[PDB]
Amino acid sequence: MYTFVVRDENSSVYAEVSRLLLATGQWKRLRKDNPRFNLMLGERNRLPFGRLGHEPGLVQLVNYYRGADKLCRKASLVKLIKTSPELSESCTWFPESYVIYPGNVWIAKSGILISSEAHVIQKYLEKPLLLEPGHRKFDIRSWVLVDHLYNIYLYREGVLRTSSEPYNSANFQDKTCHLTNHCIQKNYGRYEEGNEMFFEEFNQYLMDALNTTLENSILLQIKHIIRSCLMCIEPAISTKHLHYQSFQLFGFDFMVDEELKVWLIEVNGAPACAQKLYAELCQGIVDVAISSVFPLASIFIKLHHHHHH
Amino acid sequence: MEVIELNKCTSGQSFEVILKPPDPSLEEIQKKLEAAEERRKYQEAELLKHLAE
Amino acid sequence: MREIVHIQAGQCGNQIGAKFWEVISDEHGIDPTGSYHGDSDLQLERINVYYNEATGNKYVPRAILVDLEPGTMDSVRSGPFGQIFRPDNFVFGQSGAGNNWAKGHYTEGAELVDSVLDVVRKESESCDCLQGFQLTHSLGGGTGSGMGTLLISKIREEYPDRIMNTFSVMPSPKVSDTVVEPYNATLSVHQLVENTDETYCIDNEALYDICFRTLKLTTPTYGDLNHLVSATMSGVTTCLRFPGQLNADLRKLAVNMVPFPRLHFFMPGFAPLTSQYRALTVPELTQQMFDSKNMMAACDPRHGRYLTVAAIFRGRMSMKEVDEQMLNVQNKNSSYFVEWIPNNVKTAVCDIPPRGLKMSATFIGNSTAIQELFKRISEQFTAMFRRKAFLHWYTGEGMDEMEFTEAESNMNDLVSEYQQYQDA
Amino acid sequence: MRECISIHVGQAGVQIGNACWELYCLEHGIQPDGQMPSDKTIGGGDDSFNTFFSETGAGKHVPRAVFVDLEPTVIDEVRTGTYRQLFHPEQLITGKEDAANNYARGHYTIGKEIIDLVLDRIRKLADQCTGLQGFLVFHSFGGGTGSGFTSLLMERLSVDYGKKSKLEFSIYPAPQVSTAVVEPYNSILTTHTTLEHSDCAFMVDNEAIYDICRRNLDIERPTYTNLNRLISQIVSSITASLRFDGALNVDLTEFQTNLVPYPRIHFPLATYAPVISAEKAYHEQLSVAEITNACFEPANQMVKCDPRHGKYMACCLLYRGDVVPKDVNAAIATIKTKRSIQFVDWCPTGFKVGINYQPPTVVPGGDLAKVQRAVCMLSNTTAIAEAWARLDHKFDLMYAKRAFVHWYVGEGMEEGEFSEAREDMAALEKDYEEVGV
Ligand SMILES: CC(C)(C)c1nc[nH]c1/C=c1\[nH]c(=O)/c(=C/c2cccc(C(=O)c3ccccc3)c2)[nH]c1=O
Ligand SMILES: Nc1nc2c(ncn2[C@@H]2O[C@H](COP(=O)(O)OP(=O)(O)OP(=O)(O)O)[C@@H](O)[C@H]2O)c(=O)[nH]1
Ligand SMILES: Nc1ncnc2c1ncn2[C@@H]1O[C@H](COP(=O)(O)OP(=O)(O)CP(=O)(O)O)[C@@H](O)[C@H]1O
Ligand SMILES: Nc1nc2c(ncn2[C@@H]2O[C@H](COP(=O)(O)OP(=O)(O)O)[C@@H](O)[C@H]2O)c(=O)[nH]1
Ligand SMILES: [Ca+2]
Ligand SMILES: [Ca+2]
Ligand SMILES: [Mg+2]
Ligand SMILES: [Mg+2]
């Protein structure tokens, strides 16, 4: 009988983990401020990492990596990339970005501005890959689970969060064709349900239209970016040898251009899953992150590469 | 990485290495020790007054 | 702070009180005539806490024996360890108290109280550093209840800075001498709420049930009940009677057990309960001492929440295994331990075991579930008081109905106060 | 030279004093009776060890030590123990009745009846000094004496000796070896009242020492003897520059200059490597690189916290044994590129190194093995504020319900002193956040 606490009520992901844990008979939930927990499913802001790992006779685990915000806020992500030699200014998979405090097209963000006149100012991808029939933009979301040992587990199911409106070079003010978010769309669901193209269909399209695969044309670059990003920050956030342990689910957002090159847009620290995939992912978080640390009575692909030089 | 101000001797040595540059009075204490003794003595009086009733 | 003064009042007080001096005198290697015949120096190292040293190297208990009739005090002097007590400390009246609080507190006991206090002063005088007073009595009779609480009030007047602890045996219809016990107990509880630092609520209901249900004794005597009481009195005095690197007196223990001044009524327990060959394992002691069935106050700890817990393990065992087991019950039943007193369960181990058990555990629980005890006595009270039944015995000795109404109100306030922190 | 008076208050202070003075005697070759053969100037001197020891005409070397406890039993063991001849009876001061884990009882009630005696016994030592530096104060945050009486002493020492420095060695409370439930109250109260009177304070969380003893010494259930012998190694490391020839941390003022730029933030983290079991049959000796690297592992720190998420205002490496400057620089060079060592903008990113060639001395029949080389890193990092956050949280939980408060008020203290003291701590936590984020 292991114990947990739940300090983020909004979290759609860890609501399902809370439910899946309870429905085994071996995880009892406690009150939000009870200190005698094995597992903390914690808040987004000001999670008290200083209080973890100081309760004698309790192995304590939390579902956030302290320091991982340096990958997840846009301002600090840009600064991490320009400052770490393992990524560098000459980083082939990150758009050219600059920090100024509150083809020559850019995008401003942290209210989104796409222009040449005018937070972070980032190079806009003027010629993206466009799905057909539709002539329309998309972004790819990959879910990545980093466990207590710093194994980097990529979930096999990602999703293309599609635009329904044809892409337009001259008309920038119309946001529905340039910005590919789920909320901004809700032609909402003309080509696929809820503007979501899953990996089986998108592989098939690449095969049919371009005579290639998702694995070769795109996913190899995604696996390279995820691994390069997380191994960069490993020394700053790793909980190996530490008095408490951390795991975390990340949401990596990608853009594939016309020549089949993948670009990193943003990393997300408290990501939500797509409706269909909750049951499988949230079970996967329990098996690999939680049950590995607290044993009871593969959907992921492990990112490891040791090239010698 | 500059190794400055090296000083040596027979039992050891020391140096610096730079990787990169950039009260109340005796009155008030004796006063508030005694103010706590007033409250201590008033509380004891309230008890001995209660026990007298 | 080494010396404790012991006072035992009335029939019950002197009966369990005698059993205390029997058990600990064996534990310290003192024989029925007061002479030391032990072997370990640990038996004499803090012998001054409960014994004075006399000429010829005799040890004399720092004990005062109070009653309003001679019967029971004659029985103590005739009993096995009766000769060890200082004769001057036998202070007794003649007319008895007839199970009447008023007689004990206001008339008969008033006449005897000052001579008991002269003996208390006599013992307190020749005390290098007096840490406090301990008292044994019942709350259901007349002397131990009425006079014992009068003494407690007087002792507090003359020694207002010393710690006052009681073992207070609570009445129950299951083991009942007279119908007026709830009256006597209610009047006494109000005294204890005001004038003691710790009260160990020995409930005769619970002691009977342990003897009947869990010990298979069909017809339990007071000896069978008192056997369970003596094991617990030995248990709670272990950490003052011996070392082992624990630097605590009654005040220090009191400071750590009592978060609110009126809420100092503890729920004692003991493991194993006896009347054996296989020594218990540390997990068994731990689960038994936290089990409702082993509680000496007939309350269900699941009906309340623990403010603090203390537990004192006796015998040669692993301190690692103890820490682990104590942390196991806390971390697997954490709802019943208040989250607003961090680390409220504390533990000690003593190498010397008691006579007959290879290892034991005494449980001291300050739980809000003790309100059930006070609710039960309050219901028994009101059942009679609403018809003013049996009051003439008390109004005859000068008491007003007002004083009953007040005492009723003070005990229901105590109950409300416990209910407050059970929901906080 | 300039003299240093050590003051040991309460049980924790006294028993840690014992351990340190036992160790200091082995390090300087001073014996239980107090004779020091290697000392040739009989009856006096201005050697480095004389900062901690005075001398008599008969050749006795006597600690500049005062032991204070509100009850006799712990200091009684110093009067009858192996080092009984070492101390003059006037240095060992005891009351009859303790503070019962009550700050208010130690500060106000029982403090008042003994403070003037202690200051007098302190003045008897300060008058044997040609040039007093100041005071090393040893105590617990959790005890009533350790917390309560210490804060009163520290108030008075500022009045009577305003020109002098005051260093604390403070035992931060750990539930795993404490039977006191009210330590969060005592710790905040004494931290609040001692803060302006202490120039530099070294906190030692009993939790960390306890797990170092479990993990690295293979001790199943560590006693105070286990913990204290380890604590005194760390303390010796820290005080060695005051007792031996050298040029780093030569006086008490230099600890404040080197480690404490921002006066309120005067709690440096101590990290110590290597801790190795004497029962361990085969031990491969660790290098300058390996033990310097171990100074950035949380598992070797005196307080568990994460320096990575925080910023440094100062860092000092104190090595004992076979170490030379270039091995240290090579070790620091490797470590800068691997680990996350971020300094505050206004401070230089750098390390003050102190080496003493004498390897750590170990107490005979102790738990620690002899080692060729050891290090104690002293870093002023904002990460140590984690310990304040934990302590303040516990305080808030209890104090919200007024739990145990009546014991403090009953000894003369006012309820307002709780929230006043807690607000100082609230500001302290805020001061650490400004500096470190
Ligand atoms: C487990 C440990 C040591 C860490 C710990 N942590 C918190 N608490 C503890 C333990 C105790 N705490 C007490 O406050 C205590 C009070 C005590 C002691 C002796 C006697 C009588 C007493 O009323 C009496 C009266 C008449 C006849 C016989 C007995 C009370 N005993 C304990 O064993
Ligand atoms: N490291 C260490 N901690 C100790 C020692 N003795 C006590 N403690 C700790 O100190 C705290 C209790 O305070 P004490 O020093 O015993 O109390 P005191 O200062 O003697 O004051 P009172 O007993 O309240 O009069 C707890 O956190 C204990 O774990 C010791 O020898 N070493
Ligand atoms: N440099 C660029 N080139 C092309 N499109 C871009 C871009 N930067 C942002 N976008 C588009 O804007 C959309 C939203 O911007 P961005 O991903 O930076 O913030 P966001 O917060 O909306 C993602 P999430 O909420 O899923 O973490 C993306 O889906 C992407 O299609
Ligand atoms: N456990 C226990 N309870 C007793 C004993 N003697 C009496 N009682 C209880 O105490 C109450 C009677 O009080 P008693 O001590 O005889 O009266 P007193 O002599 O006038 O103080 C009743 O509730 C009895 O159940 C005893 O030896 N053991
Ligand atoms: Ca008469
Ligand atoms: Ca000399
Ligand atoms: Mg009777
Ligand atoms: Mg003490």
Side-chain angles (χ1 to χ4, degrees), chain C residues 170 201-207 210 225 228-229 231-232 267-271 273 293-299 363 373:
Chain C
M170 310 285 185
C201 304
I202 275 63
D203 190 349
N204 270 357
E205 190 140 327
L207 303 184
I210 295 158
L225 304 194
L228 300 177
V229 169
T232 311
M267 186 176 298
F270 194 80
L273 301 159
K293 292 195 296 97
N294 299 47
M295 299 290 161
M296 314 258 163
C299 304
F363 175 89
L373 195 156

Side-chain angles (χ1 to χ4, degrees), chain C residues 19 26 37 96 102 111 119 134 156 160 202 236 293-294 313 321 360 364 404 406-407 424:
Chain C
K19 290 288 164 198
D26 168 74
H37 265 94
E111 194 172 8
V119 174
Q134 81 184 25
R156 203 188 169 180
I202 275 63
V236 304
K293 292 195 296 97
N294 299 47
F313 292 85
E321 204 181 353
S360 60
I364 304 173
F404 281 75
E406 284 164 24

